[PDB]
Amino acid sequence: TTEIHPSCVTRQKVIGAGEFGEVYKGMLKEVPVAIKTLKAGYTEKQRVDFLGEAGIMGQFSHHNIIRLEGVISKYKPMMIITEYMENGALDKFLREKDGEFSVLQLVGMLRGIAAGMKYLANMNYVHRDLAARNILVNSNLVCKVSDFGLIPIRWTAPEAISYRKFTSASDVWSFGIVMWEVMTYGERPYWELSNHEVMKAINDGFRLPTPMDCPSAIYQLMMQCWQQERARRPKFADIVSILDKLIRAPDSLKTLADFDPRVSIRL
Numbered sequence: 001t002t003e004i005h006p007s008c009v010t011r012q013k014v015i016g017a018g019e020f021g022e023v024y025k026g027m028l029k030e031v032p033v034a035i036k037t038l039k040a041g042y043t044e045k046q047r048v049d050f051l052g053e054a055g056i057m058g059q060f061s062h063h064n065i066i067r068l069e070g071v072i073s074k075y076k077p078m079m080i081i082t083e084y085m086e087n088g089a090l091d092k093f094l095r096e097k098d099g100e101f102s103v104l105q106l107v108g109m110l111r112g113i114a115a116g117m118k119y120l121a122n123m124n125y126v127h128r129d130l131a132a133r134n135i136l137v138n139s140n141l142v143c144k145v146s147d148f149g150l151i152p153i154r155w156t157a158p159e160a161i162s163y164r165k166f167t168s169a170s171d172v173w174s175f176g177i178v179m180w181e182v183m184t185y186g187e188r189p190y191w192e193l194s195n196h197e198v199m200k201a202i203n204d205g206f207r208l209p210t211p212m213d214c215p216s217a218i219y220q221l222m223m224q225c226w227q228q229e230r231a232r233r234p235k236f237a238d239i240v241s242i243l244d245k246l247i248r249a250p251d252s253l254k255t256l257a258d259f260d261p262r263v264s265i266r267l
């Protein structure tokens, strides 16, 4: 990891909060950055988790993984400094830009996420918390995986819920949910079903229905991510390959899955 002197960092505005305190947008010496702090009194576990998050991110170098600019560890408060992503979290971004993108742009988002996830899985990093809220978006529409460190039911594979088995294949299940989030512009998975109702439906064999205006190939792919049997799910390499081929022959995306309407309008 690279150590940054505190005089090079200007915190400008609070943009959130997390397990360690405040998250800021600021400037680094001149580039915009996100800044997470850890204030005095932190416990040993907090310090281990905080610097461990920076340590994890420092091991990665990929277009679709948030870049670590550096850390402040020699001075207090300690800081993790990452590249600033101008459009913020993908979940909120989609909901605030409903219907504004082409299908090709949405599928390109998913290809980027999948490439980041393929890299993580091949680096032997299991994310455990993959969801549109944990992906960030820049001014080139590039989606990058965030949320690293040492989890809601409706994003999580059945084996991870049932017996705590988190692997790259449970991340594939989560990626299928992310596909559904992207293609619906941030709809809430399973709508108002409770967590227990979601698990019951999944065990009964039910799956999320196709989004409106969704390419058939894209819905088929998300359905395969939701195989109950972990070994039958695609690997991230398979997902990247398929998405690449669909993007390279974009007419393949014009064939849409049938949408099941909830409402009848007779005229």
Ligand SMILES: Nc1ncnc2c1ncn2[C@@H]1O[C@H](COP(=O)(O)OP(=O)(O)NP(=O)(O)O)[C@@H](O)[C@H]1O
Pocket (backbone or CB within 6 Å): 015, 016, 017, 018, 019, 023, 033, 034, 066, 082, 083, 084, 085, 086, 088, 089, 136, 146, 147
């Ligand atoms: N690099 C970044 N660029 C732009 N926004 C960021 C960046 N990193 C974090 N944020 C935003 O900062 C806020 C909280 O940071 P986040 O990484 O989500 O921490 P968290 O502990 O997960 N907080 P929450 O998600 O609120 O529990 C959210 O708006 C994040 O999307």
